[PDB]
Design an enzyme around this catalytic site. Structure first.
Site, short mmCIF file in Angstrom:
data_model
loop_
_atom_site.label_atom_id
_atom_site.label_comp_id
_atom_site.label_asym_id
_atom_site.label_seq_id
_atom_site.Cartn_x
_atom_site.Cartn_y
_atom_site.Cartn_z
N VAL A 1 0.81 -1.21 0.00
CA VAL A 1 0.00 0.00 0.00
C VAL A 1 0.85 1.27 0.00
N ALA A 2 1.95 1.24 0.74
CA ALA A 2 2.83 2.39 0.84
C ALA A 2 3.79 2.49 -0.34
N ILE B 1 2.80 1.78 -3.45
CA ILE B 1 2.01 2.15 -4.61
C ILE B 1 1.30 3.50 -4.50
N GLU C 1 -1.51 4.97 -5.10
CA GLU C 1 -2.93 4.78 -5.36
C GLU C 1 -3.66 5.97 -5.98
N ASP D 1 1.58 16.44 -44.46
CA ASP D 1 1.08 16.31 -45.81
C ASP D 1 0.94 17.72 -46.40
N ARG E 1 -0.30 29.16 -61.56
CA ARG E 1 -0.93 28.63 -62.75
C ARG E 1 -1.58 29.87 -63.39
N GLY F 1 1.90 13.44 -52.05
CA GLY F 1 1.75 12.60 -53.22
C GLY F 1 1.86 13.43 -54.48
N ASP G 1 -4.85 14.85 -44.19
CA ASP G 1 -6.26 15.05 -44.48
C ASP G 1 -6.82 13.95 -45.38
N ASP H 1 -2.98 9.57 -46.25
CA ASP H 1 -2.28 9.94 -45.02
C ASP H 1 -2.53 8.97 -43.88
N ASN I 1 6.30 7.62 -1.56
CA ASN I 1 6.10 6.17 -1.56
C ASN I 1 7.36 5.49 -1.06
N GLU J 1 7.55 6.04 2.71
CA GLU J 1 6.49 5.26 3.33
C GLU J 1 6.94 3.82 3.49
C1 TG1 Z 1 7.78 3.14 -4.50
C2 TG1 Z 1 8.81 2.96 -3.39
C3 TG1 Z 1 9.94 2.22 -3.36
C4 TG1 Z 1 10.79 2.29 -2.11
C5 TG1 Z 1 10.62 1.33 -4.44
O1 TG1 Z 1 10.93 0.04 -4.13
O2 TG1 Z 1 11.06 2.09 -5.46
C6 TG1 Z 1 12.18 1.58 -6.26
C7 TG1 Z 1 11.84 1.51 -7.76
C8 TG1 Z 1 10.85 0.47 -8.25
C9 TG1 Z 1 12.48 2.46 -8.48
C10 TG1 Z 1 13.32 3.40 -7.58
C11 TG1 Z 1 13.23 2.71 -6.16
O3 TG1 Z 1 14.50 2.07 -5.82
C12 TG1 Z 1 15.13 2.37 -4.61
O4 TG1 Z 1 14.83 3.27 -3.84
C13 TG1 Z 1 16.28 1.38 -4.38
C14 TG1 Z 1 16.08 0.29 -3.33
C15 TG1 Z 1 16.01 0.70 -1.84
C16 TG1 Z 1 14.74 0.17 -1.13
C17 TG1 Z 1 15.04 -0.40 0.28
C18 TG1 Z 1 13.84 -0.65 1.22
C19 TG1 Z 1 14.02 0.02 2.58
C20 TG1 Z 1 12.94 5.03 -7.61
C21 TG1 Z 1 11.42 5.24 -7.27
O5 TG1 Z 1 13.46 5.73 -6.39
C22 TG1 Z 1 14.42 6.61 -6.06
C23 TG1 Z 1 14.42 6.88 -4.62
O6 TG1 Z 1 15.24 7.10 -6.82
C24 TG1 Z 1 13.38 5.80 -8.93
C25 TG1 Z 1 12.88 5.33 -10.32
O7 TG1 Z 1 11.43 5.55 -10.46
C26 TG1 Z 1 10.92 6.55 -11.26
O8 TG1 Z 1 11.59 7.38 -11.86
C27 TG1 Z 1 9.40 6.43 -11.35
C28 TG1 Z 1 8.90 5.83 -12.68
C29 TG1 Z 1 7.40 6.07 -12.84
C30 TG1 Z 1 13.21 3.84 -10.74
O9 TG1 Z 1 14.64 3.57 -10.55
C31 TG1 Z 1 12.37 2.73 -10.00
O10 TG1 Z 1 12.64 1.58 -10.80
C32 TG1 Z 1 12.74 1.94 -12.10
O11 TG1 Z 1 12.76 1.15 -13.05
C33 TG1 Z 1 12.82 3.45 -12.22
C34 TG1 Z 1 13.80 3.97 -13.31
O12 TG1 Z 1 11.49 3.71 -12.65
N1 TM1 Z 2 -1.49 16.85 -69.89
C1 TM1 Z 2 -2.17 17.87 -70.40
N2 TM1 Z 2 -2.72 17.81 -71.73
C2 TM1 Z 2 -3.43 18.91 -72.21
N3 TM1 Z 2 -3.61 20.03 -71.43
C3 TM1 Z 2 -3.11 20.16 -70.12
C4 TM1 Z 2 -2.39 19.08 -69.59
N4 TM1 Z 2 -1.98 19.35 -68.36
C5 TM1 Z 2 -2.43 20.57 -68.09
N5 TM1 Z 2 -3.13 21.08 -69.16
C6 TM1 Z 2 -3.83 22.51 -69.23
O1 TM1 Z 2 -2.92 23.59 -68.99
C7 TM1 Z 2 -3.07 24.45 -67.84
C8 TM1 Z 2 -1.75 24.54 -66.90
O2 TM1 Z 2 -0.53 25.14 -67.48
P1 TM1 Z 2 0.14 26.55 -66.94
O3 TM1 Z 2 -0.71 27.14 -65.74
O4 TM1 Z 2 1.56 26.28 -66.45
O5 TM1 Z 2 0.17 27.61 -68.12
C9 TM1 Z 2 -4.23 23.86 -67.22
O6 TM1 Z 2 -5.30 24.82 -67.12
C10 TM1 Z 2 -6.49 24.06 -67.65
O7 TM1 Z 2 -6.17 22.73 -68.26
C11 TM1 Z 2 -4.75 22.69 -67.99
C12 TM1 Z 2 -7.52 23.59 -66.59
N6 TM1 Z 2 -7.20 22.63 -65.50
O8 TM1 Z 2 -8.05 22.27 -64.66
O9 TM1 Z 2 -6.14 22.07 -65.27
C13 TM1 Z 2 -8.82 24.07 -66.61
C14 TM1 Z 2 -9.36 24.97 -67.51
N7 TM1 Z 2 -10.61 25.39 -67.50
O10 TM1 Z 2 -11.49 24.91 -68.17
O11 TM1 Z 2 -10.96 26.28 -66.80
C15 TM1 Z 2 -8.49 25.46 -68.52
C16 TM1 Z 2 -7.04 25.05 -68.66
N8 TM1 Z 2 -6.33 25.64 -69.73
O12 TM1 Z 2 -5.21 25.45 -70.00
O13 TM1 Z 2 -6.87 26.43 -70.49
F1 BEF Z 3 0.02 16.41 -50.14
BE1 BEF Z 3 -0.80 15.28 -50.17
F2 BEF Z 3 -0.23 14.00 -50.25
F3 BEF Z 3 -2.19 15.41 -50.12
MG MG Z 4 -3.48 15.71 -48.68
#
Ligand code: TG1
Ligand code: TM1
Ligand code: BEF
Ligand code: MG
Ligand code: NA
EC number: 7.2.2.10
Length: 994
Positions: free
Chosen positions: A304-305, A307, A309, A351, A560, A626, A703, A707, A768, A771
């Site tokens: 309990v001490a 953990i 809780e 993207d 364009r 893309g 989007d 993606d 803890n 404790e």
């Molecule tokens: C909850 C309470 C206690 C006492 C416990 O046992 O914690 C140990 C423990 C499990 C770790 C230790 C505790 O170890 C000790 O204190 C050494 C042994 C002495 C006990 C003697 C009894 C009288 C943490 C608590 O203590 C100190 C004092 O530095 C730090 C750290 O923990 C964290 O960083 C928390 C991670 C959420 C962890 O070394 C951790 O182990 C890991 O893997 C870590 C990386 O996690």
């Molecule tokens: N592979 C292709 N083959 C033929 N035409 C093409 C191709 N690829 C692009 N185009 C046309 O070349 C343009 C890009 O080249 P810049 O901006 O650098 O000069 C593009 O513009 C419109 O059609 C395209 C277009 N569109 O959706 O893409 C719609 C249009 N519309 O109806 O409104 C008109 C286009 N247009 O060119 O007139």
């Molecule tokens: F730019 Be993306 F892949 F829509």
């Molecule tokens: Mg996209």
């Protein structure tokens, strides 16, 4: 039929044995449904509301805290009439807490959406097919479509399945595939076969993919694949086949338990070894009835001490509040864990289309002729604001607003834009946003017209719906569109033939409005419009026009461009033939040039500043798109990823150049390059994988369907609020706002969160340790129990739980975002700090137990029992002479425990203040720096005097209000802990790199 893209149109019909004129026969439909199944994706389902409860109690800590509750439960009835009044309270509360933290975890998981149920929000509802059944086209459930079906699609339609195009009905077929391929410009399709079987979607120009939509035209095709075999079907599997690790903080909390468990059982035995003395003292009193009762009473006190809780509660509370804050930014956080994880983000893959950009063609530049004087030619250039389809923005000249209508050339430009156009704009009252209707390119022109508002039409008193076509509408009434000569590849231009409508300008005669790629249109211009008049097209004039055209089509612009022209004296409708686009070019000749417009898929306004903030926080931003490289790079330049003139030698790659790199170089490329274009969905995931291989916490922003794989794979997936359904379900966060800069805030938030969590985690785990020392010492010195679980729980859940939360409100540093991300592997406690808590812990066990024994030996109003009569308080009854003095039940007095508890509480309060800063002194960083902490202390101490006065409490907690003098002792015992840590801190800062 996969690979149908490489097969010819006849080969595809043959392959399915179907007629292009009639389509499948109902019999075939039934056979294909049998052999192929419906066109849908199987429902993705797993881990019900009960399966979580299962894995819920799988937590090692819980099982231990439960396996202990069982023991404590057995020790409830085994209590004679003296303390069996609350003998079942402990074994219950322990369980009650296991139930609370049980639903605490279920609440943080139950609230989740469904991927496949969201995918159906993207999967088309209906489809259009021709089946032998009836001659007419039939609209059916898209799910009933089968390979081999003959499908018809027209502008506005959402392709219902992966389709091989058979014959294009319109002059051309343009397709918007941004949601799948990420291409920012609709694609011109064809019907010829695509040879290369290894062709990527962007190369399959004779294919139509399910989920995409028709930007322009009408086509007939044959279904090649459906269901999980569709391009989006595959991508959905990739998504379902991607694994995700636990939160680094969770892996840290698990390892902690894995170790804590080894220590517990190690102490249970270490103390057990110091019990061989029972096999020597000549005396008997309970073989299998009491010869091992005191053992299991401490064994549970240890579990309990040891953990915390109350950690789950403090953590959930902290995360939840974080999510609430995120929401205020319109950042919807789906997974509470990623709230903190965002702070360790070291790379942000992003993207382009629809994510980095708005994916809404926007005209931002335009120009008309100012004046012409011989070899002299000047142009009126203007810029336009606004990066979406919303009719919101203004036209500027020299960075200053003007009224387009005061420019005669602009009035015409707008008129060509409004009329030589087959598309329009609309306000989706549902999604509450303006949408394109038809071609993106043409819609850009539509919203341009709405912005220009050349006739100063009144639009302020309008609704979003009406505002969408007010100006365009005004212009559509001036001229009547007789017919239009649709676009064709050869000519690369388009035009409409209009006649005067109103009786205001019925003397203007028929006109032809043309638009198209600059070169061709200009070469067919014999005149140039200047305001309202016209001068012949000369070399000097043409050169000036083209030169500016060239500037925009490249360099810092890479826009364009379309030229806008009109034929003043068009041919008569009679002397024209309109059934063949091969004659159109000649009719679009002897034109008068009017102007040019520059447009592009614009970056979202907040991106550039966002990327600059990331660089300062040591976070890289990589573009994964893309779309083609030229555009990918142009945007990278426009947003700060690349310099305006930087040489993107080895910093930009295409999905292919990438593949030509050996895995080694590939991996290295992810650490150098910032732009990946013409990539595919798996390429995105791969890149993300490489990054993570270097132990980098990566985020992914997207989007589209393309993606989804990378978004899920990323430690933190970020989806745009206006993106697809798949993308949104595969993300831990959604920017319903579409504001890319909310990421930087989320990161900042996450960093402030992580630091505060680290601090309070340390705090709790710290006490803890002390404790466990207190319990150990007593169980070692044979001394009586100074603290019992009933008290350990109240403190671990309330007394300390409150200040821990107040630490979650620790103000963040002033340069929280001016330092790099901390390593994921970074341990919360080790090195010096390990020693600090090692000492603090020790100091606690000694102080608490010592405060108890103190009352049992020096309290002016307590027994003066000797140290020996305390270590041997058990055999008090029998060997009464050795303990001649008082009552043998004084070893069960509340004063000693109350003494021990009150020291614990006070020490923790003190340690709470010590936890404000890892190494900063309370001198350099005042306690009031966190008012919330100061409150949590007053509130925790009040909840203490409360447990010592309200009868119902001191009764169950085995406590008794201490003397105003006993407290003075608690203070003297506790306070010094501030001195102890102040010293340990000092050592760290100076004689260490603390
Ligand atoms: C909850 C309470 C206690 C006492 C416990 O046992 O914690 C140990 C423990 C499990 C770790 C230790 C505790 O170890 C000790 O204190 C050494 C042994 C002495 C006990 C003697 C009894 C009288 C943490 C608590 O203590 C100190 C004092 O530095 C730090 C750290 O923990 C964290 O960083 C928390 C991670 C959420 C962890 O070394 C951790 O182990 C890991 O893997 C870590 C990386 O996690
Ligand atoms: N592979 C292709 N083959 C033929 N035409 C093409 C191709 N690829 C692009 N185009 C046309 O070349 C343009 C890009 O080249 P810049 O901006 O650098 O000069 C593009 O513009 C419109 O059609 C395209 C277009 N569109 O959706 O893409 C719609 C249009 N519309 O109806 O409104 C008109 C286009 N247009 O060119 O007139
Ligand atoms: F730019 Be993306 F892949 F829509
Ligand atoms: Mg996209
Ligand atoms: Na993710």
């Amino acid at each position: 039929m996969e690979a149908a893209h490489s097969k010819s149109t006849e080969e595809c019909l043959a392959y399915f044995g179907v007629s292009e004129t009639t389509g499948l026969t109902p019999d075939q439909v039934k056979r294909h449904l049998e052999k192929y199944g419906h066109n849908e994706l199987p429902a993705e389902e797993g881990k019900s509301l009960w399966e979580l409860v299962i894995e819920q109690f799988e937590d090692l800590l819980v099982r231990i805290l439960l396996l202990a509750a069982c023991i404590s439960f057995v020790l409830a009835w085994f209590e004679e009439g003296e303390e069996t009044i609350t003998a079942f309270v402990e074994p219950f509360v322990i369980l009650l807490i296991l139930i609370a933290n049980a639903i605490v975890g279920v609440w943080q998981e139950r609230n989740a959406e469904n991927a496949i149920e969201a995918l159906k929000e993207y999967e088309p509802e209906m489809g259009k097919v021709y089946r032998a059944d009836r001659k007419s086209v039939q609209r059916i459930k898209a799910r009933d479509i089968v390979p081999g079906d003959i499908v018809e699609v027209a502008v506005g339609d959402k392709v219902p399945a992966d389709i091989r195009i058979l014959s294009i009905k319109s002059t051309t077929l343009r397709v918007d595939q941004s949601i799948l391929t990420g291409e920012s410009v609709s694609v011109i399709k064809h019907t010829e076969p695509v040879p290369d079987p290894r062709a990527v979607n962007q190369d399959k120009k004779n294919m139509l993919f399910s989920g995409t939509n028709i930007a322009a035209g009408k086509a007939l095709g044959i279904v090649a694949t459906t269901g999980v075999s569709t391009e989006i079907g595959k991508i959905r599997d990739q998504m379902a086949a991607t694994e995700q690790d636990k939160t680094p903080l969770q892996q840290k909390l698990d390892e902690f338990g894995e170790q804590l468990s080894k220590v517990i059982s190690l102490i249970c035995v270490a103390v057990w070894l110091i019990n061989i003395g029972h096999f020597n003292d000549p005396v008997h009193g309970g073989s299998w009835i009491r010869g091992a009762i005191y053992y299991f009473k401490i064994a549970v006190a240890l579990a309990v001490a040891a953990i915390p809780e109350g950690l789950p509660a403090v953590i959930t509370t902290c995360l939840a509040l974080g999510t609430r804050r995120m929401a205020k930014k319109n950042a919807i956080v789906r997974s509470l864990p990623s709230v903190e994880t965002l702070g360790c983000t070291s790379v942000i893959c992003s993207d382009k289309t629809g994510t980095l950009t708005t994916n809404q063609m926007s005209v931002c530049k335009m120009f008309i002729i100012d004046k012409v004087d011989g070899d002299f030619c000047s142009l009126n250039e203007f810029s336009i604001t606004g990066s979406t389809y919303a009719p919101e923005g203004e036209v500027l000249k020299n960075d200053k607003p003007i009224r387009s209508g005061q420019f005669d050339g602009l009035v015409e430009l707008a008129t060509i834009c409004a009329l030589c156009n087959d598309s329009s704009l609309d306000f989706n009252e549902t999604k509450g946003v303006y949408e394109k209707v038809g071609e993106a390119t043409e819609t850009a022109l539509t919203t341009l017209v709405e912005k220009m508002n050349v006739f100063n039409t009144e639009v302020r008193n309008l609704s979003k719906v009406e505002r969408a076509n007010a100006c365009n509408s005004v212009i559509r009434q001036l001229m009547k569109k007789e017919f239009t000569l649709e676009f064709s590849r050869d000519r690369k231009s388009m035009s409409v033939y209009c006649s005067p409508a109103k009786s205001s300008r019925a003397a203007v005669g028929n006109k032809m409005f043309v638009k198209g790629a600059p070169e061709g249109v200009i070469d067919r211009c014999n005149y140039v419009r200047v305001g309202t008049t016209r001068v012949p097209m000369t070399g000097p004039v043409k050169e000036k026009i083209l030169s500016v055209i060239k500037e925009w089509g490249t360099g810092r612009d890479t826009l364009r461009c379309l030229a806008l022209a009109t034929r003043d004296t068009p041919p008569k409708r009679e002397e024209m033939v309109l059934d063949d686009s091969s004659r159109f070019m000649e009719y679009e000749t002897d034109l008068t040039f009017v102007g040019v417009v520059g447009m592009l898929d614009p970056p979202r306004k907040e991106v550039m500043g966002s990327i600059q903030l990331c660089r300062d926080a040591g976070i890289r931003v990589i573009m994964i798109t893309g779309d083609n490289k030229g555009t990918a790079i142009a945007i990278c330049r426009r947003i700060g990823i690349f310099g305006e003139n930087e040489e993107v030698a080895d910093r930009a790659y295409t999905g292919r150049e990438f593949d030509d790199l050996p895995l080694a170089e590939q991996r290295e490329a992810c650490r150098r390059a910032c732009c990946f274009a013409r990539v595919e969905p798996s390429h995105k995931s791969k890149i993300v994988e490489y990054l993570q291989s270097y132990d980098e916490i990566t985020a992914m922003t997207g989007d589209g369907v393309n993606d989804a794989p990378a978004l899920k794979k990323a430690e933190i997936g970020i989806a745009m609020g206006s993106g697809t359904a798949v993308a949104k379900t595969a993300s831990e966060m959604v920017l319903a706002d579409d504001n890319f800069s909310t990421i930087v805030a989320a990161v900042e938030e996450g960093r402030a969160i992580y630091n505060n969590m680290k601090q309070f985690i340390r705090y709790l785990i710290s006490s803890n340790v002390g404790e466990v020392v207190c319990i150990f010492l007593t169980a070692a010195l044979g001394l009586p129990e100074a603290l019992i679980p009933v008290q350990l729980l109240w403190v671990n859940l309330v007394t300390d739980g409150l200040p821990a939360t107040a630490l979650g409100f620790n103000p963040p540093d002033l340069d929280i975002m001016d330092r790099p991300p901390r390593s994921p592997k970074e341990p919360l406690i080790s090195g010096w700090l390990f020693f600090r808590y090692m000492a603090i812990g020790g100091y606690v066990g000694a102080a608490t137990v010592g405060a108890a024994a103190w009352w049992f030996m020096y309290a002016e109003d307590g027994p003066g029992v000797t140290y020996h009569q305390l270590t041997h308080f058990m055999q008090c009854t029998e060997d009464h002479p050795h303990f001649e003095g008082l009552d043998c039940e004084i070893f069960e007095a509340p004063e000693p425990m109350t003494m021990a508890l009150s020291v614990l509480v006070t020490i923790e309060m003190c340690n709470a203040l010590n936890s404000l800063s890892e190494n900063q002194s309370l001198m350099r960083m005042p306690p009031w720096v966190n008012i919330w902490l100061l409150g949590s202390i007053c509130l925790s101490m009040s909840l203490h005097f409360l447990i010592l006065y309200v009868d119902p409490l001191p009764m169950i907690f085995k406590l008794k209000a201490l003397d105003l003098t006993q407290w003075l002792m608690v203070l003297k015992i506790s306070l010094p802990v501030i001195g102890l840590d102040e010293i340990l801190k000092f050592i760290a800062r100076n004689y260490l790199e603390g």
